[PDB]
Symmetry: C3
Subunit: 131 residues, 3 copies
Amino acid sequence: PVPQVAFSAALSLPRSEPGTVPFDRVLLNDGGYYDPETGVFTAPLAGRYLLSAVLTGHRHEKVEAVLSRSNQGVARVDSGGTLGVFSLILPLQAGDTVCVDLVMGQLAHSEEPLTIFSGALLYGDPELEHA
Amino acid sequence: PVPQVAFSAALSLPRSEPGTVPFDRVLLNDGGYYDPETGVFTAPLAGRYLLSAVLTGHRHEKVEAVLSRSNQGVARVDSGGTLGVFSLILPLQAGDTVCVDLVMGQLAHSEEPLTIFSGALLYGDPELEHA
Amino acid sequence: PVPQVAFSAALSLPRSEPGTVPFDRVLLNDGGYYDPETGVFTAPLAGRYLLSAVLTGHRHEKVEAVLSRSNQGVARVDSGGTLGVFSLILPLQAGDTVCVDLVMGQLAHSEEPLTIFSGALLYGDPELEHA
């Protein structure tokens, strides 16, 4: 079959927001699949997919590292301003969910950056089984 | 059918040029399709394609943002040293034309950087119609 | 036929290493094909592939440029801290091998950074011949 799924959204709100930023730029993503408002990414794709996250510089320090399902830790989108970090590929389980850790030092500063999260389907698993 | 099109060129001229730079490194692009001398990109591909522009740092300030056909503004290749900015995907119309705006402040300095413009075909629209 | 090959490894050793870093994070690469311990990349893929190298900043100066088979020089993974530099595409010969040049100034400092080398197959040459 052909899952033909693509997904990508852009954030550009005006100024001071009440908290974290949602996404109003629907560029391409009918099913949505991964809500960037909560970051709860439910990926049924099953296959090989191209993921790309935009890394804010923020040289003021702190450690950003997104959790990865099945191992926790695992920085695929690593930002240092059984466990390893990867960027190109994407070892993800069917239905599993990814979550961002954003807490590595309390005494810090207050800020609200912006981030773009795109990720398009490249190839899906076409059975590929052999009894 | 199979449009099988790829296009990408590299710039590396010696030193001071009389103005903007052309491209003499033919890596892979028989049809050419998008003239990087004028930037008039006529894309007949129609489908999903992979585009990648190289961002010069130039921290000296000024705002670089490439125009996008149908809306004007629209920074897909955004560089800040209905309208939104995207990097991974590429919503382009068949025959559409992309153009860069490079004017956001007159009182500035004179310089001539270099830029690499690669972009390879990923998947094309194979009819996909259903009466 | 279907070569179905993917390859990518991650390095994260503890602290001071005796020399260059190997790779213990097997993310996806059964054949291996390109040993990152020596960098001797033997690519039989033959087709179009997506390559991505991670560039360490190292603003302390020096010139890093990976050699390219068939021409020598040719900086595909260029880092300046018949010959041209490209990043997206990948003009590689079947069986040829790529090697990194890491010597552009003797009077320098001693350091041992880390690097991630991923590269996944996109499309292979399916005969495409026409007597």
